[PDB]
Structures are given as structure tokens and as C-alpha cells.
Enzyme design. Structure first.
Site, mmCIF file in Angstrom:
data_model
loop_
_atom_site.group_PDB
_atom_site.id
_atom_site.type_symbol
_atom_site.label_atom_id
_atom_site.label_comp_id
_atom_site.label_asym_id
_atom_site.label_seq_id
_atom_site.Cartn_x
_atom_site.Cartn_y
_atom_site.Cartn_z
ATOM 1 N N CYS A 65 0.550 -1.428 -0.047
ATOM 2 C CA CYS A 65 0.375 0.287 -0.289
ATOM 3 C C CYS A 65 1.082 1.574 0.083
ATOM 4 O O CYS A 65 1.328 1.827 0.931
ATOM 5 C CB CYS A 65 -1.028 0.087 1.488
ATOM 6 S SG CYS A 65 -1.571 1.252 1.285
ATOM 7 N N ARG A 68 0.111 4.420 2.966
ATOM 8 C CA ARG A 68 -0.009 4.364 4.029
ATOM 9 C C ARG A 68 0.402 5.590 5.576
ATOM 10 O O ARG A 68 0.511 5.570 6.847
ATOM 11 C CB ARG A 68 0.881 2.873 4.596
ATOM 12 C CG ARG A 68 0.729 1.883 3.867
ATOM 13 C CD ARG A 68 1.183 1.095 4.853
ATOM 14 N NE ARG A 68 2.839 0.261 3.266
ATOM 15 C CZ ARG A 68 3.653 0.193 3.467
ATOM 16 N NH1 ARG A 68 4.556 -0.201 4.486
ATOM 17 N NH2 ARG A 68 4.560 -0.259 2.486
ATOM 18 N N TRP A 237 -8.944 6.981 -0.551
ATOM 19 C CA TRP A 237 -9.673 7.028 -1.722
ATOM 20 C C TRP A 237 -8.855 6.503 -3.109
ATOM 21 O O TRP A 237 -8.209 6.652 -2.683
ATOM 22 C CB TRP A 237 -9.261 8.800 -1.585
ATOM 23 C CG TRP A 237 -8.153 8.876 -0.803
ATOM 24 C CD1 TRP A 237 -6.954 8.596 -1.796
ATOM 25 C CD2 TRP A 237 -8.215 9.898 0.153
ATOM 26 N NE1 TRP A 237 -6.237 9.505 -1.169
ATOM 27 C CE2 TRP A 237 -6.256 10.181 0.114
ATOM 28 C CE3 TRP A 237 -8.525 9.929 1.190
ATOM 29 C CZ2 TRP A 237 -5.591 10.435 1.069
ATOM 30 C CZ3 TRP A 237 -8.546 10.282 2.532
ATOM 31 C CH2 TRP A 237 -6.184 10.432 1.984
ATOM 32 N N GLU A 242 -5.891 3.646 -10.996
ATOM 33 C CA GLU A 242 -6.369 1.782 -10.449
ATOM 34 C C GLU A 242 -7.412 2.329 -11.460
ATOM 35 O O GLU A 242 -7.779 1.596 -12.069
ATOM 36 C CB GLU A 242 -6.722 2.452 -9.200
ATOM 37 C CG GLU A 242 -5.633 2.460 -8.010
ATOM 38 C CD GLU A 242 -6.093 1.926 -6.693
ATOM 39 O OE1 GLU A 242 -6.934 0.940 -5.921
ATOM 40 O OE2 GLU A 242 -5.910 3.436 -5.482
HETATM 41 C C1 HEM Z 1 -5.940 6.449 1.495
HETATM 42 C C2 HEM Z 1 -5.880 6.044 0.225
HETATM 43 C C3 HEM Z 1 -5.294 4.578 -0.029
HETATM 44 C C4 HEM Z 1 -4.902 4.619 -1.314
HETATM 45 C C5 HEM Z 1 -5.174 5.814 -2.592
HETATM 46 C C6 HEM Z 1 -4.245 3.159 -0.995
HETATM 47 C C7 HEM Z 1 -3.695 2.695 -1.926
HETATM 48 C C8 HEM Z 1 -3.201 1.405 -2.428
HETATM 49 C C9 HEM Z 1 -2.625 0.735 -4.134
HETATM 50 C C10 HEM Z 1 -2.746 1.441 -5.137
HETATM 51 C C11 HEM Z 1 -3.051 -0.888 -3.455
HETATM 52 C C12 HEM Z 1 -2.569 -1.958 -4.299
HETATM 53 C C13 HEM Z 1 -3.297 -2.343 -5.030
HETATM 54 C C14 HEM Z 1 -4.135 -2.513 -5.876
HETATM 55 O O1 HEM Z 1 -3.692 -2.030 -6.788
HETATM 56 O O2 HEM Z 1 -4.993 -3.889 -6.145
HETATM 57 C C15 HEM Z 1 -3.157 -0.755 -2.129
HETATM 58 C C16 HEM Z 1 -2.858 -1.793 -1.334
HETATM 59 C C17 HEM Z 1 -3.226 -2.190 0.477
HETATM 60 N N1 HEM Z 1 -3.872 -1.020 0.462
HETATM 61 FE FE1 HEM Z 1 -4.115 0.717 0.266
HETATM 62 N N2 HEM Z 1 -4.658 2.841 0.025
HETATM 63 C C18 HEM Z 1 -5.536 4.018 0.602
HETATM 64 C C19 HEM Z 1 -5.878 3.190 2.000
HETATM 65 C C20 HEM Z 1 -5.961 2.123 2.408
HETATM 66 C C21 HEM Z 1 -7.105 1.914 4.028
HETATM 67 C C22 HEM Z 1 -7.252 2.785 4.153
HETATM 68 C C23 HEM Z 1 -6.076 -0.520 4.312
HETATM 69 C C24 HEM Z 1 -6.737 -0.085 5.014
HETATM 70 C C25 HEM Z 1 -7.384 0.130 6.315
HETATM 71 C C26 HEM Z 1 -5.478 0.539 2.948
HETATM 72 C C27 HEM Z 1 -4.884 -1.036 2.899
HETATM 73 C C28 HEM Z 1 -4.496 -1.578 2.077
HETATM 74 C C29 HEM Z 1 -3.833 -3.680 1.808
HETATM 75 C C30 HEM Z 1 -4.448 -4.061 2.958
HETATM 76 C C31 HEM Z 1 -3.662 -3.363 0.224
HETATM 77 C C32 HEM Z 1 -2.579 -4.843 -0.266
HETATM 78 C C33 HEM Z 1 -3.822 -5.941 -1.431
HETATM 79 C C34 HEM Z 1 -3.282 -7.571 -1.493
HETATM 80 O O3 HEM Z 1 -2.356 -7.137 -0.975
HETATM 81 O O4 HEM Z 1 -3.900 -7.155 -2.405
HETATM 82 N N3 HEM Z 1 -4.871 0.573 2.365
HETATM 83 N N4 HEM Z 1 -3.176 0.115 -1.419
HETATM 84 C C1 SKO Z 2 -3.420 -6.809 -5.592
HETATM 85 N N1 SKO Z 2 -5.114 -6.240 -4.963
HETATM 86 C C2 SKO Z 2 -6.160 -7.512 -4.996
HETATM 87 C C3 SKO Z 2 -7.555 -6.300 -4.688
HETATM 88 N N2 SKO Z 2 -7.396 -6.027 -3.332
HETATM 89 C C4 SKO Z 2 -7.460 -7.404 -2.372
HETATM 90 C C5 SKO Z 2 -6.766 -5.631 -2.943
HETATM 91 C C6 SKO Z 2 -6.672 -4.844 -1.236
HETATM 92 C C7 SKO Z 2 -6.519 -3.668 -1.148
HETATM 93 C C8 SKO Z 2 -6.204 -2.505 -2.150
HETATM 94 C C9 SKO Z 2 -7.209 -2.548 -3.636
HETATM 95 C C10 SKO Z 2 -7.656 -1.702 -4.597
HETATM 96 C C11 SKO Z 2 -8.496 -1.490 -4.520
HETATM 97 C C12 SKO Z 2 -8.405 0.401 -3.138
HETATM 98 C C13 SKO Z 2 -8.353 -0.107 -1.858
HETATM 99 C C14 SKO Z 2 -8.629 0.595 -0.893
HETATM 100 C C15 SKO Z 2 -9.024 0.618 0.284
HETATM 101 C C16 SKO Z 2 -8.204 1.936 -1.314
HETATM 102 C C17 SKO Z 2 -7.261 2.405 -2.488
HETATM 103 N N3 SKO Z 2 -7.169 3.227 -3.341
HETATM 104 N N4 SKO Z 2 -7.440 1.055 -3.328
HETATM 105 N N5 SKO Z 2 -7.138 -4.134 -3.808
HETATM 106 CL CL CL Z 3 -10.246 -0.827 -7.650
#
Ligand code: HEM
Ligand code: SKO
Ligand code: CL
Ligand code: HEM
Ligand code: SKO
Ligand code: CL
Lengths: 362, 362
Positions: A65, A68, A237, A242
Site C-alpha cells: 500500500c 500508508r 480514496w 487504479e
Molecule cells: C487513503 C487512500 C489509499 C490509497 C490511495 C491506497 C492505495 C493502494 C493501492 C494502489 C494498492 C495496490 C493494490 C491494488 O492496486 O490492487 C493498495 C494496497 C493495499 N492497501 Fe491501500 N490505499 C489507501 C488506503 C488504505 C486503507 C485505509 C487500508 C486499510 C485500512 C489499505 C490497505 C491496503 C492493503 C491491505 C493493500 C494490499 C492488498 C493486497 O495484498 O492485494 N489501504 N493500496
Molecule cells: C492486489 N490487490 C488485490 C485486490 N485487493 C484485495 C485489494 C486490496 C487493497 C486495495 C486494493 C485496491 C483497491 C483500493 C482499496 C483501497 C482501500 C484504497 C484504494 N485506493 N484502492 N485491492
Molecule cells: Cl478498484
């Protein structure tokens, strides 16, 4: 073995959590209380402070992520009190409303009762609370292919989509004791959507593209101190890429680059014209422009990487090891334009954290 | 230990090489010859067939290289006979000429005598045979920052650059027995360069950008069957992103994106305008257009990834394990537009291969 795993995770979490909260002197007594509680009941119950900070730590430890920096302002909603499917539904409706916040998105997590003996109390089937349906029949693809299996499972349960390219899937979840999940149509007044337009190219609206405002992941497990919150939907957000580089662009998603190329007036015939790259840039500009114009929160990948750089600096200043997954942190557009591309990250798993779990459909 | 390492590497290489060449029946006798040769001399000498196929296998095993489909057509030049610095110089001049081939670039490697007891016979100081100098003094940056240390080392030896942004560095190398390397100015008639223009934007030429035609890596070690060819320069043709997304774009290289933004008529003030991404696309279009117009070989990243997909298919069909480094195989522009982005690769090291070695400057 089960209880031992639980107790070991409990000791590590309580020590770390209480240290961060400046409450280290209370660790010993709290651990004693916990150890006896495990002995008698086979589990333990988090205080509201532990649950909140645990959810925040989990986000902070999410290697993939980029968002963070803001881990400590996560809005944690404790719904461990829910017992009925109406209570669950209403809690999910409420999450959407409060997270959406009229477009000024609040990162939020709603935490439902945890597994007991690995027995789930509430099992959410949706991948995200708000997502579009997908269909495939007789060579005809409609909507979001990523949702095909869940859509088919919903239609097994009596739901029927209008077969538009943007049907909102119903909420669908199963309660402990029930054999089948229930489903509930989303009240459209709760769901903000954004039409995609381009700041300079009037014809872009001819594509009739849109996306939803708030991504709310609802199928990951939150693990805190050995307790498994399999149902704990969370949102942030969007980062614009994405939507513009993946959801609307991927050949296995909405696959719009050829149509984008046409509306922006370029040929889509030669690799060396880099028409896909040009289309991706314009689509991604349109996405950011459209969310901004509507007053819905969004971040571009340059700003997001700059924020992540501050997260790295903050981690070092706090004396915390930084973990990350380079392959997911780099954005899918101009990654070498970000500092992330030019360094490496330790991909070690630290808990609390969020984890994948098996789908109940498929 | 040394000889044992050599003998073990020798057995593995000869077996594999001869199997691939359909000459498996000859392995036993050849290995006997080798084992005695090691016993008596402390090393062994590759046949011309082994050296050629070994160099090809090494390229085939290069995990970070997207261009590997063409591994079997590598043009191998055996220069293990060189003894004098004039012979080395002339062999390097010849490599440039034959690899350049009037713009129709031929992937080529020239192989010099190998290390004996870890003692180098020829030590090439250049990173690439053709590269631009870089200077930094009193806040003033000129040319390519990546070449600053080598440039300073050259100027220690009596060379002097004109302090243009594109000074060609001299060839510089050291012979066994000499304390100092010698240097030789590159005959400009040997060096093809390409002025960068844009297919649609006349003003692009105002930037006065150019790059050289042929990248010739000259500081990696080729290892084949336990023999260390520390001096073995090799070349391919460029993938356009190397020039447009890195060499001319990186803030620590030529840093041209702001100037590109200006000539293409866009503001460079807001992250959300994605002006860097737009500038990168246009710069990369200009690079491909310019090389094509001049009749100098180049590949765009889409075509390159398509070729790499065929390399993957060929590997499976030949029953060979595929190895790759995802972090280097994805292009720095629109990586998710390529199949590479969407799969994973085993990053295991297989020999023969090319390896980093310590710089003699720095
Ligand atoms: C505030 C805006 C946020 C943005 C812009 C953001 C952005 C992203 C992006 C681009 C990914 C890549 C995964 C993908 O594209 O499929 C990601 C992964 C992740 N985010 Fe965030 N995120 C945000 C907030 C959060 C919040 C609030 C949480 C949980 C409390 C979170 C937990 C995660 C987790 C667990 C992943 C990994 C998922 C996986 O292994 O597939 N994120 N985030
Ligand atoms: C590789 N990720 C697989 C799909 N999953 C489980 C996943 C988990 C976390 C975040 C995302 C991308 C969608 C997303 C979620 C959140 C919370 C924020 C964000 N900007 N975009 N996708
Ligand atoms: Cl999405
Ligand atoms: C024919 C055209 C070729 C293209 C387009 C190509 C492309 C590339 C690219 C883009 C990289 C990434 C490294 C970087 O960007 O700094 C790379 C790595 C590499 N290529 Fe190729 N290549 C080609 C031919 C060759 C040849 C002929 C050889 C050797 C015989 C070779 C050996 C390598 C090696 C060893 C690396 C890894 C270097 C490292 O670890 O830093 N390539 N190639
Ligand atoms: C990460 N690479 C560090 C620089 N080195 C050693 C290196 C090695 C191999 C290839 C490159 C990129 C330059 C290049 C070389 C060759 C032979 C072909 C090509 N298209 N581009 N660079
Ligand atoms: Cl280069």
C-alpha cells in the site's frame, strides 16, 4: 497448538501496542488477564483502544500500500456487537455513507465479530462493497469481467442484473447458522459515481465512462494479536491510476484504450506510435479531472509517491523498520518518475496486518 | 578449492553445451582432456564452438534482459589472440564498426583473453564503448552525470573534454603489466548518432537532443564453464524507453522533462495534470521516430515484450526452465500494458551468465 499460537501473538501485540500508546506499565497486568481469559474461554476480547490501534498498525504494515502515510487517522468503527443480518446490512450502509462523506472521503474500517474456533460469525461475499457486475454469455461481454463469478453467484440467489455495463452488485453476506447468504440492493442515494470527462477533449464524454467514488475492500481478514476479524471492510480514496490504468484500461477489465485512442484523434495501428501510452495518459488525466470537478477525493500517483516518501521518513524517525512490496508500490504509469522505482524494500510480513482468505463462491 | 570450482563448473557446462549441440557422445572424452589440462596448467581452453555457444547461453540466462528471443543469433568474435594495446584498440574499433553495420545493428560480442589466476589480461574501464562524458564543478552540471567519475579519471590521464553536453569519452583500458590504462579518442566516423526530432512538433528540435546508436556494455564479466572473461564487450540495439524514459528523462541523468513539457506546449506546474507522463510519452515517441527515420535499429517496448513472450514460449517448448527478474523486465513506460507485468518470474541465477565486477576507478 491453537491456544499457544494465540497466546504468543497476544503477547507480541499487546507489548508493541501498549509501548506505542505509552502504556507499557500496564502490559503485565493486561497479559495476565488475557492468559487467564484464554485458559477459560479459548480466546480473548480486545479493548476498544487495542482494536483501534491494531487496525491502524495493520494498515501501517501493509507492504503493497502506497497510501500508508495516513495510517494513524484511520476511522475505526467497532461493530463487534452485531448479531442479525439487518444489523450487518445497516452497518454496511452506514460505512458507505460515513466513508463517502459527501465526496470528502474518510478512510474508515468497520469491524464485525471475529472468528471463534475458525468459525465465521459474518461472512461477506463482496470483494468491494460497491462494485460493478460482469456478464459473459454467447461471446457477449458486459460490465466488469472481474465480477463474473460473484455476479453468477448472486443470480443463483434470485438477484437479476439489468445488464448495463455498470450494474451495482447487491451487498451479499452470510450469517453463522445460515446455509445461504442473503443479498440487499444498494440504495443509489448512498453511492456516488463520477462521469469521466476530459479537461480539453469534448468528445471524451462520447465514451460514456464512469466509475464509483469509494473503493471499500470487504473480503480481507484483519489479524490483530492472534484474533481473526475475517469481516472488516475498509476504504481509502482512489489513486487515479487504479481507475485509468487498470479498471478501465486492462484487456481483462473494461478494455477501453482503443476507444480512447479514437476519441482523442490518434491512430491505434502501430506499436511505435505509442498510441497505448498516449491513450493511457489522457484517460488518466480525464479520471483525475473528473473526480476533482465533482468534489470527490482522489490522489494522482506523483503526489501519492511523495506522501509515501514521507511515510518512509516518518518510519525511520520513529525507529520502526520499513517494509514494502516494490512490485505493487510502483504505479503502473511512469513508475520511474517516482522515487519508489529507484530504491528497494524489505518485503517481510509484520503483524497486525490484512490477509487474503478463500472465496466462498468459486 | 579453485581448481575444484573450475572442474565442477566445467563438467556442468560441457555436458549442457554438448547436449544442446547434439554432441553428447563427445562429452566423456572432452571432459577427460579438460581434467588433465586443469591438472597440468591450472585452467583449460574453450574450443571456438564452446566459446560461441557459451556466450549465447549466457545471454539466454540474463534474467533482466527483455531482448533474449534473439540469443541464438548473437555474433561472437573470438579475440583471445590479442596481446598488445594496439590489437585491443583495433578490436574495439572493429566491434563498433561491425555491430553498427551502417545502422542495421548486429548483436555482437568480442571476447578477449580470460583471467588466469584471477589476473586480468585486459581490463576495460568504459561502462559502454560509446558514452558521453559528464562534469560537475562549481554548481555547474554538463553532460551525463552517470559518467562523472569515469570522466574525472580520464582527465587525470591527460584527456580533456570539450565540455559539450555530448562529449564522446575515449576508449580506456589497461593491459596486464601496465600500471596505468591507456586511452584512445573514438574516430567520429565510427560513431553513429541520432538527432532527436518529433513527428508532429517542429519545435522539438529546439531542445537540440541526440543520442548514440549502439549501446555496447564493456565492463561486465562473461563466465562460461568456470572461465572468467572479464573483458568481453557486447551490444544489442536500444529499446526506446532506455533513451526516452531514463537517459534523457531521469533527474540524475539529462533531466529533460521540464524542457520537453515546454516545447510540447503544456504547463509543468500541477501533479494532477500528469505533465511528466505526457512529456515522457512524447519524448519516447520522438526517440523511436528519430531512430527509424535515420535507419538505425531500435525496438519499442510493446514489440519488445511481444518478442519476450515468444522467448518464454520457446523456452517451454525446448524444455528449458525460464528465469527472469520482473523488476527489470517491465518497461518504465506503461508497464501494465505488457504481459510481463501480469505474471511472475523465477529470479534464479543460471550459468553461463554475465556478472558485475568492481570498477578500477572509484
Ligand atoms: C487513503 C487512500 C489509499 C490509497 C490511495 C491506497 C492505495 C493502494 C493501492 C494502489 C494498492 C495496490 C493494490 C491494488 O492496486 O490492487 C493498495 C494496497 C493495499 N492497501 Fe491501500 N490505499 C489507501 C488506503 C488504505 C486503507 C485505509 C487500508 C486499510 C485500512 C489499505 C490497505 C491496503 C492493503 C491491505 C493493500 C494490499 C492488498 C493486497 O495484498 O492485494 N489501504 N493500496
Ligand atoms: C492486489 N490487490 C488485490 C485486490 N485487493 C484485495 C485489494 C486490496 C487493497 C486495495 C486494493 C485496491 C483497491 C483500493 C482499496 C483501497 C482501500 C484504497 C484504494 N485506493 N484502492 N485491492
Ligand atoms: Cl478498484
Ligand atoms: C538486441 C537488443 C537488446 C535489447 C533491446 C536489450 C534490452 C535490455 C534492457 C532494457 C535491459 C535492462 C537493463 C538496463 O536497462 O539497465 C537489459 C539487461 C541486460 N541485457 Fe539486454 N538487450 C539486448 C541485447 C543484449 C545482448 C546482445 C546481451 C549480451 C550478449 C544482453 C545482455 C543483457 C544483460 C547481461 C543485462 C543485465 C544487466 C544488469 O544486470 O545490470 N542484452 N537488456
Ligand atoms: C541495470 N543495468 C546496469 C547497467 N548495465 C551493466 C547494463 C547491462 C546490460 C544492459 C544495460 C542497458 C544498456 C543496453 C545494453 C545492451 C547490450 C542492449 C540494450 N538495449 N541496452 N545496462
Ligand atoms: Cl544506455
Amino acid at each position: 497448538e491453537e491456544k499457544e499460537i494465540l497466546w504468543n501473538e497476544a503477547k507480541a501485540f499487546i507489548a508493541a501496542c501498549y509501548q506505542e500508546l505509552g502504556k507499557a506499565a500496564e502490559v503485565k497486568d493486561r497479559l495476565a488477564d488475557i492468559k487467564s481469559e484464554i485458559d477459560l474461554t479459548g480466546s480473548y476480547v480486545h479493548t476498544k483502544e487495542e482494536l483501534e490501534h491494531g487496525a491502524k498498525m495493520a494498515w501501517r504494515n501493509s507492504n503493497r500500500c502506497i497510501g500508508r502515510l495516513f495510517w494513524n487517522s484511520l476511522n475505526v468503527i467497532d461493530r463487534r456487537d452485531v448479531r442479525t443480518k439487518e444489523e450487518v446490512r445497516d452497518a454496511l450502509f452506514h460505512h458507505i455513507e460515513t466513508a463517502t462523506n459527501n465526496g470528502k472521503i474518510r478512510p474508515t474500517i468497520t469491524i464485525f465479530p471475529p472468528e471463534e474456533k475458525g468459525e465465521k460469525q459474518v461472512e461477506i461475499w463482496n470483494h468491494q462493497l460497491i462494485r460493478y457486475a460482469g456478464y459473459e454469455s454467447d461471446g457477449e461481454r458486459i460490465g466488469d469481467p472481474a465480477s463474473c463469478s460473484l455476479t453468477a453467484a448472486c443470480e443463483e440467489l434470485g438477484w437479476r442484473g439489468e445488464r448495463t455495463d455498470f450494474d451495482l452488485l447487491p451487498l451479499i453476506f452470510r450469517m453463522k447458522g445460515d446455509e445461504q447468504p442473503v443479498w440487499y440492493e444498494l440504495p443509489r442515494s448512498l453511492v456516488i459515481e463520477v462521469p469521466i470527462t476530459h479537461p480539453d477533449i469534448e468528445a471524451f464524454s462520447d465514451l460514456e465512462l464512469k466509475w464509483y467514488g469509494v473503493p471499500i475492500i470487504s473480503d480481507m481478514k484483519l489479524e490483530v494479536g492472534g484474533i481473526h476479524y475475517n469481516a472488516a471492510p475498509f476504504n481509502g480514496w482512489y489513486m487515479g491510476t487504479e481507475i485509468g490504468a487498470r479498471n478501465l484500461a486492462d484487456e481483462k477489465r473494461y478494455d477501453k484504450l482503443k476507444k480512447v485512442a479514437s476519441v482523442i484523434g490518434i491512430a491505434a495501428d502501430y506499436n511505435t506510435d505509442l498510441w497505448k501510452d498516449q491513450a493511457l495518459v489522457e484517460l488518466n488525466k480525464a479520471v483525475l479531472h473528473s473526480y476533482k470537478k465533482q468534489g470527490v477525493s482522489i490522489v494522482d500517483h506523483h503526489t501519492a509517491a511523495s506522501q509515501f516518501k514521507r511515510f518512509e521518513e516518518q518510519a525511520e524517525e520513529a525507529g520502526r523498520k520499513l517494509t514494502g512490496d516494490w512490485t505493487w508500490l510502483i504505479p503502473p504509469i511512469s513508475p520511474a518518475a517516482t522515487h519508489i522505482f529507484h530504491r528497494s524494500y524489505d518485503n517481510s510480513i509484520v503483524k497486525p496486518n490484512y490477509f487474503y482468505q478463500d472465496k466462498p463462491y468459486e
